[PDB]
Each structure stands twice: as structure tokens, then as C-alpha cells.
Enzyme design. Structure first.
Site, PDB file in Angstrom:
ATOM      1  N   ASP B   8       2.345  -3.418  -1.625  1.00 16.60           N
ATOM      2  CA  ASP B   8       2.546  -2.096  -2.251  1.00 16.60           C
ATOM      3  C   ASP B   8       3.659  -2.055  -3.283  1.00 16.60           C
ATOM      4  OD1 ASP B   8       1.109  -1.756   0.188  1.00 16.60           O
ATOM      5  OD2 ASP B   8       1.591   0.397   0.204  1.00 16.60           O
ATOM      6  N   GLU B  39      -0.661   1.239  -4.975  1.00 18.69           N
ATOM      7  CA  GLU B  39      -0.823   2.625  -4.556  1.00 18.69           C
ATOM      8  C   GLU B  39       0.418   3.502  -4.725  1.00 18.69           C
ATOM      9  OE1 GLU B  39      -1.138   4.419  -0.966  1.00 18.69           O
ATOM     10  OE2 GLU B  39       0.604   3.433  -0.062  1.00 18.69           O
ATOM     11  N   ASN B  40       1.589   2.887  -4.862  1.00 22.90           N
ATOM     12  CA  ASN B  40       2.815   3.659  -5.030  1.00 22.90           C
ATOM     13  C   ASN B  40       3.432   3.445  -6.408  1.00 22.90           C
ATOM     14  OD1 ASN B  40       3.082   2.486  -1.856  1.00 22.90           O
ATOM     15  ND2 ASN B  40       3.264   4.706  -2.122  1.00 22.90           N
ATOM     16  N   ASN B  67      -3.694   5.333   0.550  1.00 24.62           N
ATOM     17  CA  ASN B  67      -3.753   6.767   0.810  1.00 24.62           C
ATOM     18  C   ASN B  67      -3.236   7.634  -0.336  1.00 24.62           C
ATOM     19  OD1 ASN B  67      -1.351   5.387   2.105  1.00 24.62           O
ATOM     20  ND2 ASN B  67      -0.622   7.517   2.134  1.00 24.62           N
ATOM     21  N   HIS B  68      -2.401   7.074  -1.210  1.00 26.96           N
ATOM     22  CA  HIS B  68      -1.873   7.825  -2.355  1.00 26.96           C
ATOM     23  C   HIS B  68      -2.694   7.681  -3.635  1.00 26.96           C
ATOM     24  CE1 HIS B  68       1.804   9.180  -0.441  1.00 26.96           C
ATOM     25  NE2 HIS B  68       1.993   7.963   0.036  1.00 26.96           N
ATOM     26  N   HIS B 150      -5.581  -0.911   4.269  1.00 23.27           N
ATOM     27  CA  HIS B 150      -4.402  -0.053   4.148  1.00 23.27           C
ATOM     28  C   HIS B 150      -4.343   0.841   5.380  1.00 23.27           C
ATOM     29  CE1 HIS B 150      -1.254   1.287   1.406  1.00 23.27           C
ATOM     30  NE2 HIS B 150      -1.467   2.528   1.822  1.00 23.27           N
TER      31      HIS B 150
HETATM   32 FE   LIG Z   1       2.442   2.279   0.116  1.00 25.16          FE
HETATM   33 FE   LIG Z   2       0.153   3.899   2.046  1.00 29.60          FE
END
Ligand SMILES: [Fe+2]
Ligand SMILES: [Fe+2]
Ligand SMILES: [Fe+2]
Ligand SMILES: [Fe+2]
Ligand SMILES: [Fe+2]
Ligand SMILES: [Fe+2]
Ligand SMILES: [Fe+2]
Ligand SMILES: [Fe+2]
Lengths: 264, 264, 264, 264
Positions: B8, B39-40, B67-68, B150
Site C-alpha cells: 500500500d 489504494e492510499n 477499500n479506498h 486486501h
Molecule cells: Fe491501505
Molecule cells: Fe485498505
């Protein structure tokens, strides 16, 4: 001062792994204090009186616990009768047992504190404020202060580690049954690792029978609670604290399984 | 074939770390495929079009998510224009983007699949059945199959790894931002690790400003979303697959930070 | 004495409903005390100073809150400076504002306590012990004690009601935005209802635009935070306490909407 | 067409209430269809074959279930063998039993569908899409379509009611064991209520012994599973569907307890 800590012991396979390798680890590392998390020792959850004594006999000076502390009701029969058993300190006032113990061994004294996280877990009292309280109490007796933080969320574990940096000697995580690779010494001298891992079946799912756990994920139907049997693993850490500076100077990971042979 | 996977990427410090070290890692390890979880990447959550291309420019062949994925709504403007962005395949039918992509190197295609866990996370479609569907589909086309799962729960990650053993070439976990030490090759030849970890600030809490996160734990009050600034870290793995047997033969962890200096 | 309590005010439609109907309810029922939960009053979450004054003007003697207390940041600048505004008492020591207030009005005195549940909610301090603590504080001064328990789980709400029976004059639930039909007087005289309901849009989902909420359920994707348009509703209870026995003697539900016309 | 629905039957006291009052209710309201949720009927969780037959004997035409469907393991040996028993339809494909049943009365047939929510519950398949699938199936066979949605979150229950408005004849919620007061006919003609409530002990906590539940909240320690003694209650609804327009035209709540005496 050197501390050997062994991660969550899971059922008889974990107990067998402790019986064989803790004495060998103690010979190899000559720790002043040996601490074992026994929260899954009784057939995967909780603790019996016999098991408490066998873990001590295997070389533990103290036993820490976690969210499964109460799963075998027999624990209520002996918990206040044995000397070196700790359960999470942030269970409400009035809870049987203790959340801190002072381990006197090899001429030294180590304060051993057990705490339980709240993210993804039951709403216990705040472990941050509880840590402060117990650290200040412990510091009046010894500068050697160890915390086994039994928690799910990496954020909560790292937060506690950073929060107590320079005040606790070491903060080690347990609960997730997977050892992390982030062992380090924080800037103010506190040894830290997010999770020590487990001691028990190597080829289950966190110690549990694979077929049952996978079935639950796929079907959403209940399954029998079944501890795995087969290959075994042991997870631990060895932490060195400088006797002059009181700072941690080394934290080394221990893994013993078919992928990590044990030497010497 | 050899695969380099980077965990990540968190905000600009994570992007900086990728820009410097991914090229150096490619020189050192000479991977055939490079995959980065982004994702971040957009100031802590989500992705922008410029950032996608910048990650590709730094050496990525494909970008996986989590998830983001949808936190910056700009993503809906470019998700159909970029070629190798993968989001969790188990978002409901009709979700923009895709859950699998194929990249090719030295005559062989690698299928790259992203899935998201459900324990402690939103109720997406079942990732286990989705994995079955995508593995079967990919296998018609290539025997080289990579999954970035994830997820939060170690039980769910290990269950998927074991469940797909011998069917996926490799399953790596992301999401918790802490690298695990349990990298191994499962019995049927699938490379596995519970979490690769994160790439970004080293002395935040999972990449976030320490003070803000600690304050939230202690007060239960809202805090500003604030990415940390300071020392940086990169987490990844290098995985080798035997192209005769199709089994993974090595999975090595990468950590680059002040506690694990990088050597060419 | 008689108490009128109005459930969670949601956005401008909720405020409009309060402005129109609380004065009419006060004329109809002639309560000695009027209490309004304002936790969603500022566009669906939190409370501004302007709205606090507006709720008082509409007839509130006290305002209680909930999990959204802190969402409009201006509250930090007035919460300590206005009278008879309470927030959940079980936020940690040091939290701005008060969890108990004493209302003197229409000739008598009422302790108003706000608490927040922990099931499916953040890990605040234990509301059961906090209830004991605040009831004992209030009982140094007055026998009239009212609790607004803001909680999700029916088990937790009922448990608190039963736990405080004979000690609190009345315990009412808020937070789920749906009025329950279980208003009753418990055996030791405490008036009780699991949830008073909400005051605001009638044809949203708990006050929110239907299409946004349905979309989130179906897609698991982010949606805009949007308070619903259309028909409105008000939910409340009227509670009578015997001035000599201190027992509650009546608890009557109030519903005002197209399905329950208001009669002056 | 008239439907009588009885909310979660809890243990023997619930069974006692059903045996006495369902016949009286059928006499009073003369429903064409009588449906009972039996998910807690066997000592508080699950259903035995003997109890299935006893609920039918008491007047049920169909029995719906919920999250405790699988707790009494004998259900695996009879569920596929008895008529008009349904479990939540959104358990994964391959789950025993069925999620829809067709009950015949007079010249009319009622499609009875059972679904389970996912908020605060296990990650089953999406109940919204499953509702779409089953309503489409049912509508080809009968315009009378009833859904028992077993769910925790009020937002999820309301979202399903609104989502299916004009497509299902009635949507009633169960699971929280507290009857709601928000019974209404939605704009497109669907009868709706957030929770019908429970049938069983009146002075427990959701049917369970009060002291055990309070202890669990205060201590976070294990407690024995114990159905409450004492007075009892029954919760239900009576729904009228216009045979010409196929719209619901009335939904009346039933409560029978010390605070709501039964007449006739
Ligand atoms: Fe993350
Ligand atoms: Fe995450
Ligand atoms: Fe454990
Ligand atoms: Fe644990
Ligand atoms: Fe609210
Ligand atoms: Fe709320
Ligand atoms: Fe139930
Ligand atoms: Fe249920």
C-alpha cells in the site's frame, strides 16, 4: 536484562511445541525472564490449572492471556490461587485475577502487564489510560516494564507502542496469530512488535482445522470448533534491555517450523 | 518468472519512496512483472489519473487497489481510460473498472487479480467464490495467476491462501499496513504472505500522523485526516515461479527504512 | 410533574417540525419540562449555536445529544458556555461539555442525563457504571431523574432501563430513528421506551435521501450525504411522574405525520 | 386477502403464548394466511422438528426463520422434508432448505420470502438483489408477495421496504425483538413495519434472563444462556391486501401483554 516471550499457545500441539522448544530456547538465549501467552492453551481457548502448571514447568516465569481468558470456567477455581498469571488489566474493576504481576527471577524484577484492545473486540475499559496507570505503578518498583497487548487492529497496537515509548521497556502485540516483521526499537527506547504470532499448528488457519474454517467462510453456516493437527510452529521474541540506560537495545524474532529450522 | 510486488502506497511520502526505490529494486532483482498497490496514493486515500501514470512511470506494470478505491471521485472519470488498474473484483456486478488484468513479459502472461476481504469490512460479494471464478477464467489463458487480497482478518487471508493453493501461483495480503513474517510456499506450490505491509511514512501510525491517531484512541472524538511526514519506509515481496512446474519456488520480503537499509 | 421529550431532530425539516409542533404540544400537554434530542439538527449531523438557540426558542428547556455531537466543529466554542445542553456523559474525562444538567422550571427540578451505548458504536466508557455514578450525583440533589440513552442495540437499551428501574424516573432510547411500541412503566416505577424515534423527513431512510441510501446498500460505493425532501414527521413521548410517590404513572407516545394527524 | 404474522417466538414461554393466542387471533381476525417466525423457538435458538409441527398445530400455515436457523442440528435432517418452512434466501447457493414458499388458501396463493440483513450480521449474499430475483419469480405465479426481513439495522430494513415498494405486498422486519410503531402503507402500496417484535418473556431482555444480560454488559465476562421466567408477551401484525388493486390497505399491530390486554 533479557526477556523471552512466546506467542499465543494453541491447544495440545502448542503445548507440545512449548515443552520441546522453550527449554532449548532458554539454554540458547539464557533469558532472565520467560513469558508465555497461554490464552488458547486449553483445547484452543482458555486455561486449566494443570495446563498453567505445565507451562510453568516448561520454563515460563509468567503466563499472559487475552480475550479467551474466561472460556473454560474452571479458571475461576484457581486464578486467584496461582502466583504468575496475568489477564487483561482493562477488564472492569472486580474482575477475578490480576492485570499486572511482578516477576522475580534470576535476581531481577520485571513488571508484566497484559492489556486487551477494543477495536473489533468487546468494549473493555480504555487500555491507553489503563497502561498509564499501571506503568506509573510499576515504575515505583522497577524500571523494567513489559506489556503484552492482545489486540486485533494494527492501528491500535502501534498507537499503544508509540504512546508508551520511553515509559514501557517493551510492548509486544498478540492475538492475530501471525508474526509481524516490524520488530524495532522506538525513538525513546521501547522495544516494539505488532504481533509475536502463535505457537501451535502451522498448517491450520490460525491453529484451527482448515476445512472447517474455509467451510464457514464459503457457507456462512456454523462449524464445529476444531483445533488443527499436523505440523507445528513456535513464535516468540527475545528482547534485551540495557541495565544502565534502561532502554531496549535489541528485539529479535523467533520462528521455529519446517520453514525456519532451529539451531543450537 | 519473477514478480516484484509493492505494498500500500500512502500519500506523497509513499509516492516519493516508490519513485526512488522501485527503479533500484528493478535493477537489483530484475523482475519480469512489477505490481504496486496504490489504494492510499492520493493523499492517503484513493487515486488520481496523474498518480496512476506516475506509478507506472516509476516501474509498475499494474496497480492494485482496495477499500479506498472510490474515495476520490475523479477515479470515475479515468477508470475506463487506464489499461492496468485493478480494483477488488468482488464489488457488485456493474461496478466501474475491473478485477483482473493481464500483463505480458518474456513470452508469458501474468493474470493479476484484486479481491477484498469482508471480515471487519463492507459486505461485498464473497471473495472465495469470486476467486474460483477468476482463477478458472484466467487458467484458460495462462497458468501464472497472482492475487492481491486486501483484507483485515488474518483468518480470512490465510483461508484464501490455503483455499487457492495449487490454483493461484501466489496470494499476497494487503490492507493492515504492517508486513508479516509468515512468507512461505504452501504445499501445492502457491507463494503466500499474510500482509506485504505499506510504503510511506515509517513513524506515523500506519502512515497517519501519530498525534491525531493517539488522540482519537484516547478521546473517542473526531480528528482531522492527516498523513504523517518524516521518515519513510517501503514494503514489498519478490516472488519466483518455476515456469516448468508452475510452482512458486521463492518468496522473499523487502523492507527499506532506517532499520533496514537498502543495498544495491 | 410532566415531561415532554422529542426524538432526534434531523436537519432543517426536523427543525421546521419542531418550530411548528413543539409549541402546540406544550399548549396541549402543558409539560413542566421539555427535552429535545438535537444530535442531527444541523443538516443531519451535529448542532450549531444558531440551532441550539432556535430549539430553545421553540420550547426546549434542555437539549440532549448523541454520536454526532462533534460533527459541527463550532460546538467546541459554545458547548461550555450555554445552559442545559448535554452530550453523552460516558465520553472520557476531559471531553468538552457536560453529561448531566439540572433544569429548574415551571416551578420544579429535573436532572437530565445523556448516555451513549457501545454495541455497534465506538468504545466509550461503560454507560452502566456511568449511569450509577450520575444517578448517585443527581440523587444528592433531586429525586427527579431523566435519562436519554443514545444506543443502537435493543439489548443494551433494555438492559439499561431494567438496570436503573426504581432509580431513574424515566429512561428513553434514541439513535435508531424509529419509534418503538414498547413504552411501559417498569416494576419499580421507571417509565421506559426503547426508542422515541426521529423528527424530520418521513419518506427518507432515517431522514436521508432514499436513493442515496439504497444505492449504498446495492453497490457498496460512496454516496453523497443528503437529507431527504418531502413529508415530515415528529416523534416524542409525554411522561407523568407522581410528585409524591416518585413513580412514573403514564408514558404516552407522540407521532405526528400523514398517518397520525395532530389534534390540538 | 388478510395475513397474520407472529414475531420471533422465543423458547417455551413463546411457544406457550402461540398455543394460547394464535387460535384466538385467528378467530378474531380470520386471516387467510398465518405466518410465524420460529427462529428462537427451541429453547431460545433454532427449531426442532417437534416444535415445527407444534407451531403448525397452533395455526401457522408457514414458518419463517433467521440467523439462528442452524442452531439445532436436527434441522439438517428435516428442513428439506416439511412443507412451508423457509430460511433466509440469501444464504449461499447450496444451503439446505429454501428461501421462498407458496402457501395456498381458498383461491389465493401467498408467496412467502425470508431474507436476512447484513449490517451487524454475517456477510451473506446481498438481500436487495436476492429480493429482486425472488419477487420476479413470485410475481409470475401470484401477485400476493410477503417478505420477512430478519435484520438488525433500521436503515437496512427501511431501505428494503422502500426499495421493494409496489413490488412486494408486504415487508415486515424481525430480529430485534422489540416492536416498532412505524407500521404504514408505503406510497406504492406496500405494507411495512420495521420490527414486528417478539413472542415470549415480557420481563427479560429480548427474552433472556435480565440478570445474566446485565452482568454481561457490566463485566464483559461469559454468562449462561438462559431464557427468562415470568410474564409473557405476543407481538404480531395483521395486514390487509385489496384483492382488486393488489395494494395493501391496512397494517395493524398486535401486542398482547399485561400492558395490552387481549379482547375476544
Ligand atoms: Fe491501505
Ligand atoms: Fe485498505
Ligand atoms: Fe490467541
Ligand atoms: Fe485472542
Ligand atoms: Fe440521530
Ligand atoms: Fe445517533
Ligand atoms: Fe430472534
Ligand atoms: Fe435473529
Amino acid at each position: 536484562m533479557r526477556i523471552l516471550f512466546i506467542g499465543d499457545v494453541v491447544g495440545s500441539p502448542g503445548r507440545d511445541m512449548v515443552k520441546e522448544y522453550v527449554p532449548k530456547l532458554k539454554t540458547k538465549y539464557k533469558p532472565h525472564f520467560t513469558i508465555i501467552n497461554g490464552e488458547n492453551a486449553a483445547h484452543g481457548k482458555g486455561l486449566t490449572e494443570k495446563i498453567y502448571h505445565s507451562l510453568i514447568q516448561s520454563g515460563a516465569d509468567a503466563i499472559t492471556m487475552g480475550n479467551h481468558t474466561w472460556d473454560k470456567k474452571e479458571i475461576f477455581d484457581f486464578i486467584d490461587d496461582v502466583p504468575n498469571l496475568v489477564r487483561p488489566a482493562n477488564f472492569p474493576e472486580g474482575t477475578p485475577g490480576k492485570g499486572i504481576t511482578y516477576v522475580k527471577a534470576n535476581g531481577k524484577e520485571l513488571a508484566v502487564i497484559n492489556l486487551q484492545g477494543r477495536t473489533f473486540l468487546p468494549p473493555l475499559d480504555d487500555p491507553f489510560l489503563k497502561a498509564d496507570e499501571l506503568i506509573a505503578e510499576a515504575a515505583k518498583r522497577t524500571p523494567y516494564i513489559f506489556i503484552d497487548f492482545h489486540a486485533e487492529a494494527t492501528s491500535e497496537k502501534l498507537a499503544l507502542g508509540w504512546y508508551t515509548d520511553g515509559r514501557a521497556s517493551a510492548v509486544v502485540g498478540t492475538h492475530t496469530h501471525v508474526q509481524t516483521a516490524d520488530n524495532r526499537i522506538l525513538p525513546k527506547g521501547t522495544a516494539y512488535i505488532t504481533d509475536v504470532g502463535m505457537t501451535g499448528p502451522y498448517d491450520g488457519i490460525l491453529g484451527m482445522d482448515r476445512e472447517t474454517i474455509i467451510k464457514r467462510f464459503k457457507t456462512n453456516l456454523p462449524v464445529r470448533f476444531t483445533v488443527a493437527e499436523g505440523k507445528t510452529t513456535l513464535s516468540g521474541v527475545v528482547i534485551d534491555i540495557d541495565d544502565q540506560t534502561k532502554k531496549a537495545v535489541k528485539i529479535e524474532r523467533i520462528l521455529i517450523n519446517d520453514d525456519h529450522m532451529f539451531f543450537e
